[PDB]
Design an enzyme around this catalytic site. Structure first.
Site, PDB file in Angstrom:
ATOM      1  N   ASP A   1      -5.183   5.011  -9.353  1.00  0.00           N
ATOM      2  CA  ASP A   1      -4.932   3.667  -9.877  1.00  0.00           C
ATOM      3  C   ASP A   1      -5.604   3.459 -11.233  1.00  0.00           C
ATOM      4  OD1 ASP A   1      -3.724   1.183  -9.899  1.00  0.00           O
ATOM      5  OD2 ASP A   1      -5.106   0.239  -8.481  1.00  0.00           O
TER       6      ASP A   1
ATOM      7  N   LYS B   1      -5.925   2.614 -14.928  1.00  0.00           N
ATOM      8  CA  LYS B   1      -5.242   1.761 -15.911  1.00  0.00           C
ATOM      9  C   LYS B   1      -6.331   0.909 -16.557  1.00  0.00           C
ATOM     10  CE  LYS B   1      -3.995  -1.559 -12.233  1.00  0.00           C
ATOM     11  NZ  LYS B   1      -2.934  -2.471 -11.712  1.00  0.00           N
TER      12      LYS B   1
ATOM     13  N   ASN C   1      -8.521  -1.445 -14.580  1.00  0.00           N
ATOM     14  CA  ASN C   1      -9.492  -0.817 -13.671  1.00  0.00           C
ATOM     15  C   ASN C   1     -10.599  -0.041 -14.381  1.00  0.00           C
ATOM     16  OD1 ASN C   1      -8.450  -1.861 -11.298  1.00  0.00           O
ATOM     17  ND2 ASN C   1      -7.042  -0.140 -10.982  1.00  0.00           N
TER      18      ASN C   1
ATOM     19  N   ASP D   1     -12.130   0.122  -8.693  1.00  0.00           N
ATOM     20  CA  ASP D   1     -10.962   0.015  -7.808  1.00  0.00           C
ATOM     21  C   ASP D   1     -10.532   1.334  -7.177  1.00  0.00           C
ATOM     22  OD1 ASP D   1      -8.832  -0.842  -6.298  1.00  0.00           O
ATOM     23  OD2 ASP D   1      -7.873  -1.993  -7.892  1.00  0.00           O
TER      24      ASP D   1
ATOM     25  N   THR E   1       0.623   1.053 -10.096  1.00  0.00           N
ATOM     26  CA  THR E   1       1.298   0.244 -11.111  1.00  0.00           C
ATOM     27  C   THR E   1       2.275   1.064 -11.951  1.00  0.00           C
ATOM     28  OG1 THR E   1      -0.581  -1.284 -11.271  1.00  0.00           O
ATOM     29  CG2 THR E   1       0.942  -1.229 -13.144  1.00  0.00           C
TER      30      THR E   1
HETATM   31  O1  LIG Z   1     -12.945  -6.448 -10.357  1.00  0.00           O
HETATM   32  C1  LIG Z   1     -13.708  -5.633  -9.830  1.00  0.00           C
HETATM   33  C2  LIG Z   1     -13.262  -4.742  -8.860  1.00  0.00           C
HETATM   34  O2  LIG Z   1     -11.944  -4.773  -8.497  1.00  0.00           O
HETATM   35  C3  LIG Z   1     -14.107  -3.818  -8.245  1.00  0.00           C
HETATM   36  C4  LIG Z   1     -13.784  -2.851  -7.271  1.00  0.00           C
HETATM   37  C5  LIG Z   1     -14.634  -1.747  -7.198  1.00  0.00           C
HETATM   38  C6  LIG Z   1     -14.414  -0.736  -6.265  1.00  0.00           C
HETATM   39  C7  LIG Z   1     -13.344  -0.797  -5.386  1.00  0.00           C
HETATM   40  O3  LIG Z   1     -13.147   0.211  -4.482  1.00  0.00           O
HETATM   41  C8  LIG Z   1     -12.487  -1.888  -5.432  1.00  0.00           C
HETATM   42  C9  LIG Z   1     -12.712  -2.898  -6.366  1.00  0.00           C
HETATM   43  O4  LIG Z   1     -11.872  -3.964  -6.420  1.00  0.00           O
HETATM   44  O5  LIG Z   1     -15.420  -3.805  -8.646  1.00  0.00           O
HETATM   45  C10 LIG Z   1     -15.912  -4.673  -9.583  1.00  0.00           C
HETATM   46  C11 LIG Z   1     -17.260  -4.640  -9.929  1.00  0.00           C
HETATM   47  C12 LIG Z   1     -17.767  -5.523 -10.876  1.00  0.00           C
HETATM   48  O6  LIG Z   1     -19.083  -5.486 -11.213  1.00  0.00           O
HETATM   49  C13 LIG Z   1     -16.929  -6.443 -11.482  1.00  0.00           C
HETATM   50  C14 LIG Z   1     -15.588  -6.465 -11.124  1.00  0.00           C
HETATM   51  O7  LIG Z   1     -14.728  -7.352 -11.690  1.00  0.00           O
HETATM   52  C15 LIG Z   1     -15.059  -5.591 -10.178  1.00  0.00           C
END
Ligand SMILES: O=c1c(O)c(-c2ccc(O)cc2O)oc2cc(O)cc(O)c12
Length: 275
Positions: free
Chosen positions: A137, A139, A142, A159, A178
């Site tokens: 994922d 992009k 992320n 993510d 995506t």
């Molecule tokens: O948006 C985030 C995020 O999707 C994620 C995220 C991280 C790991 C995962 O497996 C899934 C997630 O959504 O972590 C963040 C950490 C931050 O300090 C600030 C963020 O905006 C995110």
């Protein structure tokens, strides 16, 4: 595997919202015992077996298991995991400079600005691929900056909702991210491996240099049709003053055959990247 089932609010105070997805919200928080700050992701659990609202526990456990492996400066780290009947809550590393996506919208970059980001992404992915972890994922939404008000921002990959371990050189699960960033093998429902991330990286690099998306069509299906047909080109209006070596880097990543695509080790030895 089960997680800490104490009330998360007994140990953390939440604050500003940082991110928001389909079945999840991410909130800034502060651990009471240490004053240290984190990002808490609230993932909605499936309430029935055959449901489609929320995240299956199998998927939550895969994501948590991959996250717990990670210790690297260019990849987000996981601190703790809580759960209750409604949610699994990930206590994740705080990154406060927002998405690379929104950073790019504030501005196109020079090649040097482009490679300062790319090198970090490549080092992060190199770490991941060395552990046989496919992100699936990648992009600009992320990729998060630690601080966007510095000349050379430091980034972390986030993510891992689609991430998979690749123990057999390829996986064959239900995996689809995506459209603008997915490789042809994803579009065509083929076995997937580490090579898919490398394709995403070529798309990201194209976007960094040009400010344009190479496969984007007027609709999701058209974008996917373009991806599978490798329907992209370097528009002179965007790339006329971009080095041919930067184009070569991208061209060696946007290859339909995963076996002919540059690996993460190759990408690091590429003349555009290599010092
Ligand atoms: O948006 C985030 C995020 O999707 C994620 C995220 C991280 C790991 C995962 O497996 C899934 C997630 O959504 O972590 C963040 C950490 C931050 O300090 C600030 C963020 O905006 C995110």
């Amino acid at each position: 595997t089960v997680f800490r089932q104490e009330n998360v609010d007994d140990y953390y105070d939440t604050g500003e919202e940082l991110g928001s997805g389909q079945f999840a919200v991410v909130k800034k928080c502060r651990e009471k015992s240490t004053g240290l700050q984190y990002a808490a992701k609230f993932i909605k659990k499936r309430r029935t077996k055959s449901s489609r609202r929320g995240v299956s526990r199998e998927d939550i456990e895969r994501e948590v298991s991959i996250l717990k492996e990670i210790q690297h400066p260019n990849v987000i780290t996981l601190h703790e995991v809580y759960e209750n009947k409604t949610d699994v809550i990930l206590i994740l590393e705080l990154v406060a400079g927002g998405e690379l996506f929104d950073f790019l919208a504030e501005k196109s970059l020079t090649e040097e600005e482009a490679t300062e980001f790319l090198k970090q992404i490549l080092n992060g992915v190199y770490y991941l691929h060395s552990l046989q972890i496919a992100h699936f994922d990648l992009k600009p939404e992320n990729i998060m900056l630690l601080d966007r008000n510095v000349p050379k921002p430091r980034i972390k990959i986030i993510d891992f909702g689609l991430a998979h371990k690749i123990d057999f050189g390829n996986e064959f699960k239900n995996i689809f991210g995506t459209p603008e960033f997915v490789a042809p093998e994803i579009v065509n429902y083929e076995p997937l491996g580490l090579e898919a991330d490398m394709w995403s990286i070529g798309v990201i690099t194209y976007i960094l240099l040009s400010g344009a998306s190479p496969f984007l069509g007027d609709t999701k299906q058209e974008t996917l049709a373009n991806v599978s047909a490798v329907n992209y080109e370097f528009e002179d209006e965007y790339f006329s003053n971009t080095s041919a070596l930067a184009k070569d880097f991208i061209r060696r990543l946007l290859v339909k055959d995963p076996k002919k695509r540059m690996t993460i080790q190759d990408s690091l030895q590429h003349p555009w990247i290599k010092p």
